[PDB]
Design a protein around this nucleic acid. Sequence first.
DNA 1: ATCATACTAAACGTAGACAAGTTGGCCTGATGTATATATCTGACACGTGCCTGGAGACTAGGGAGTAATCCCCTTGGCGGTTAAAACGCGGGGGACAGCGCGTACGTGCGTTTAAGCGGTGCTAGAGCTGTCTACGACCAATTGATTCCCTGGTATCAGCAAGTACAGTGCCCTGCTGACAGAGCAGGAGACACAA
DNA 2: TTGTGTCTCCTGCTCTGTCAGCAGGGCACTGTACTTGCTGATACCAGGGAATCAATTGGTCGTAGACAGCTCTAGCACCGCTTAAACGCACGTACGCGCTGTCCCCCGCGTTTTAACCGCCAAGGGGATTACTCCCTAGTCTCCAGGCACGTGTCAGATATATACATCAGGCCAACTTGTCTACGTTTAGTATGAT
Lengths: 96, 98, 99, 97, 83, 83, 102, 75, 111, 121
Amino acid sequence: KRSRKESYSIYVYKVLKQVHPDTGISSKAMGIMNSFVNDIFERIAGEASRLAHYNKRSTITSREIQTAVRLLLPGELAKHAVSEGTKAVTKYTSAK
Amino acid sequence: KRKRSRKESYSIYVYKVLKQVHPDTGISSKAMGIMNSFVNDIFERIAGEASRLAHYNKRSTITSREIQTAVRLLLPGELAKHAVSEGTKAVTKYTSAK
Amino acid sequence: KKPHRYRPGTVALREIRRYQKSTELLIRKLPFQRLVREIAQDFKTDLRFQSSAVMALQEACEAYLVGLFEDTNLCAIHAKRVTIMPKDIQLARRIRGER
Amino acid sequence: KPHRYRPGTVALREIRRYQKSTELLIRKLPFQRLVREIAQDFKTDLRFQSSAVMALQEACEAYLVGLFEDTNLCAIHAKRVTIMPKDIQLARRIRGE
Amino acid sequence: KVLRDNIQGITKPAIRRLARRGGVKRISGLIYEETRGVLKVFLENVIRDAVTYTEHAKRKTVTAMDVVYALKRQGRTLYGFGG
Amino acid sequence: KVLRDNIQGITKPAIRRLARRGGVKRISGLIYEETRGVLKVFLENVIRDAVTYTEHAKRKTVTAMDVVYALKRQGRTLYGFGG
Amino acid sequence: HAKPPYSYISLITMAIQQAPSKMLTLSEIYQWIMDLFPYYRQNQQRWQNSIRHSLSFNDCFVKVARSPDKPGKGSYWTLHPDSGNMFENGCYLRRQKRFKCE
Amino acid sequence: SGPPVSELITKAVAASKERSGVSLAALKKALAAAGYDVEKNNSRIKLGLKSLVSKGTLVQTKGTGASGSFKLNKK
Amino acid sequence: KARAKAKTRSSRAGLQFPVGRVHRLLRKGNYSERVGAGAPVYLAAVLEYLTAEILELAGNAARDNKKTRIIPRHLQLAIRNDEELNKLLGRVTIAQGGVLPNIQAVLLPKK
Amino acid sequence: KARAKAKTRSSRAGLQFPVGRVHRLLRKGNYSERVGAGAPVYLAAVLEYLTAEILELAGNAARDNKKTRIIPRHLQLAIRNDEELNKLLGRVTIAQGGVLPNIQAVLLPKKTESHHKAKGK
DNA sequence: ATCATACTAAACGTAGACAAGTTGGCCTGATGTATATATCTGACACGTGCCTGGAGACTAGGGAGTAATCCCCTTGGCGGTTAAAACGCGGGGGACAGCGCGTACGTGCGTTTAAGCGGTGCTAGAGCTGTCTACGACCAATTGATTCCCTGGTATCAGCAAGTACAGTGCCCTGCTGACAGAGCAGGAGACACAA
DNA sequence: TTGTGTCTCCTGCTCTGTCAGCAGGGCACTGTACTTGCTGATACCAGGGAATCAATTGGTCGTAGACAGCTCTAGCACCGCTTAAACGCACGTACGCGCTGTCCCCCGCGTTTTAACCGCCAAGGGGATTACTCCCTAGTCTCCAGGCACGTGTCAGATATATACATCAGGCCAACTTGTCTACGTTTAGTATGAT
């Protein structure tokens, strides 16, 4: 048999080719980007879990994620991340 | 008519431990609140570290082994040793008396 | 007869001993509460504060400033001085990572 | 007479050279032996993945570089340009180590 | 009802006492504005986090637990006010 | 098989290079032993945490993930070796 | 009253030697001169500073400490034995061939 | 051109005649007040002081070289 | 009858990152008992935005260095030059990244 | 069949802290899908031990201060005096705790032999 | 004939010419870095097979939203007390600047060392799959531990007045020195008065 | 009537008194924190009771993981050769540290202003609790395509070589200032000439 390890490599590459069409990325840089994505996922998810627990709620909704994003990221990053997340959720809700 | 939700606390257990250590010394309400905060803080530290240990090894159960490793990771040397000794004693006694 | 007068630095050490022995809050409560309400006014208007919240804020702020002054005193002494200068606070914050 | 740079010139050249590079500055084999020696106190007959030793070296060199930056700031604060053990001690004390 | 310049309410004797508790013997004259700025920055950070917690709960009153969680987020855990 | 004095393998030029990357122009002669002590303490802490992680998994080989988790717990998160 | 012709060195030597123990301090010297010369009741600071300078300058006097702290408030001065007689044969005013250590 | 700096140094030290010798900073202030481009003549003042000390016209009290305080000779 | 053609939730949200995988990681990460439908979408959007920002800056640095591929040095330069990201990633070490070229003005030669 | 007399899980383990409450908090804290039988016992034992340590040190401090009630000042003194707890609680601030009294050696006055009145240089 | 007085020569004092020391700026050689061009190789990017994990469809039930109510804690106001803050002023000593020096550290060269690379060989141990059994989730009924409130009683702590102990500051005596001024006494020369 | 011995004045060395300053220390006075005692306030503790809610016991059932066995990955050991880095030493200078001096900044203390603190009262805003309900997310089954492993081509970065350019450091020329020597003016000695 052969193993199977998942990662964000293809999605990072898609985003890269969206931003810089003619730029590539080395394997070490791709590993660093995977580590970064995992780290930020962990931070936001943990903060959202703490927010849900503090209010005696058993669900992590988009509101908890929004508050976690505002708590973690600094000012301009927080504002832009909130805008992008709100746009994505609205588009998903309308499209389905 | 209109009740108020009961608030759980470690105050009685802290008082029992204190009277085990210092039978004559008391403790003030502010100190009791500080000790409650300390107990909750260390509880959440050990529980979070145990959860991360279980997640890394792809195990869905937290056992006394995960708690032991968490205690080894968090507390410094002598505290870690004494805490491990106390925990092992407690678990062995619980298993025997069960 | 001239009145009694302590030399410079003696009453400073007396004050150090007094305020290290004690534990009460050193900032006046009411001005600090007004400051807390002022700063919070920018983030959300018409906020209310539990008294416990203001007391917690004051405790944390005083502890932070005391620790910062310990670090800046060490920084000043490292430069073979006794007077703490603003550059000492700047260095302490820089090494701590706040700047 | 042979050419001879004044003190501090080659030092600045070295600073410029090593700040724009990225390769590890400690020799790999001595650091690996040190890592194996230190780990021997905790558990005998341990083994290390090569990537584990590389990660340890990366973390150690990054930590030392940051510590030396803080030490240089401490030295400059005292109207000096030479870093001394008191500077490392002050940086560690303020950091919380 | 509006608050304007209460940072000056952290008077010189108060900063002097805080320095004294820190073991400072002699204080420069420019420390006080610097200390006011540092305190203002710290308060702004903590209050921003606390008010974010308050808004998430859809409350209007900033509870002590909000301040405790905000401080813990900075890595400045506070004992004595719950948690 | 045994290892006795490998801390001396962090030679004077290596510490000099590390200081140079940090922006140090002039180095006192007593820095080298101090730097060796600091590095030894840091390595001891990180390796202790890594070996604890290895022991919990009932393994005999210290993997890169153990080192990464140890560094993250220390508050020195490392990118480039998975996780 | 008239100023005594005797030089301060001669006065100090006579005060030291007149005691039963051949020893006196500055306070006792003041007591002796007050008792035996009413003339010196004036120019008090002048002659006090003069005798202090003479005591600190002349090599024919050497100081000795006090073992159990004594009554205190000042040290004690012993006459140098090697000086012998210097004011003998009536020359109390200007000694010839002053005593010297070197 | 004016007179040589040695004459100005002697004039400055003889102007005040404090019980202790005049310090280097005090002499520099005196020369500046009297009128002199002391900014670019620090070496001139230092070597003049050294020469005057060597010739015995000036006696140095506490310090060495240009440091310390200087006063007029015995005669 | 036959089912409709499957469409990835990322396609509905207009994202590149995986909404399904993010939802699985939330559910199996022991973060809460339940996970809302929009939480994965929001989190994936935020992660994609942050990744796009860092990649933009890293590509700019690489172009400045006259290279076609991004390497860890370029990511280090991008992160530490930008104030917001450097604040976000202040306590992070990037393997094979360097340090920002800077020398204290006191050390420079006295011209 | 008749039920046997109930024994608290703390009583079986010989603890004072609650094994049952700790088990409930572990289950409801969203730490893992499942919680073993001995994990609450181990965690309760560790928490009881740490509480005993801090209370012992705080009572010693209060006794040294001639007080019969532990207050936050005594907790602060106990924590900062012991290096192990201070390392454990380095990033923690105790309300109404104050600080350890210490003055840097260079700040203390320099002894002088002369008893003359102080004057400006 | 003998003296002083003026012209000239040589000693003495002072102003100016000469040569030596110090500083600044420009020119030239050496050296490291930066740039340009050719070769090549292995690390990236793209293509194919597949399999497992995400999407579609449906149901169940309980977590979350909303409305009503209550009473608790926040806000606001008023007045008096006095503790703290603000201001002013004298002056001590500490921060800062300047100079000196000596030795610790930087640069450079020759020799020694072992790190680095490549290749070979072996096997401890990571990593996976398959069994199956003990362990943990879940539910119902029992009950006992934990919380809240009230009462009586107590210990403890806080505040104020009085005495004590410790320590800080500086008077005032005593001791030591540089420098200016002044009495004694040895030795040499002018005046007094004697011997021949 | 004069040479000569002794008396008395003039000279200078030796030693002393005196003005002012600085420094060492015994001990008096002052101030402030600590200790003791008492009074009043309140915060803790113990007992009792009711509420309540959740921990325990007993039983069933599903699957997480301990254990066994196999594959083959990569961690470890060794050897040989090349050469880049480390080490030791020589030499010089510039940087750390000590010392001195000064004068402005902060400390200490007295007096006035002021706003904090306490106690009390009142109103009502919003947090907390309770009941009902509905629709959103977990659970289950089916199915297929998205992502991952493997394989292969090529061109972007690495290496090597050559050439250019910027920078560093030393040497030398030119300008400013000071030490040493020399010539003009003043004054005294030598010789010619006028006065008496």
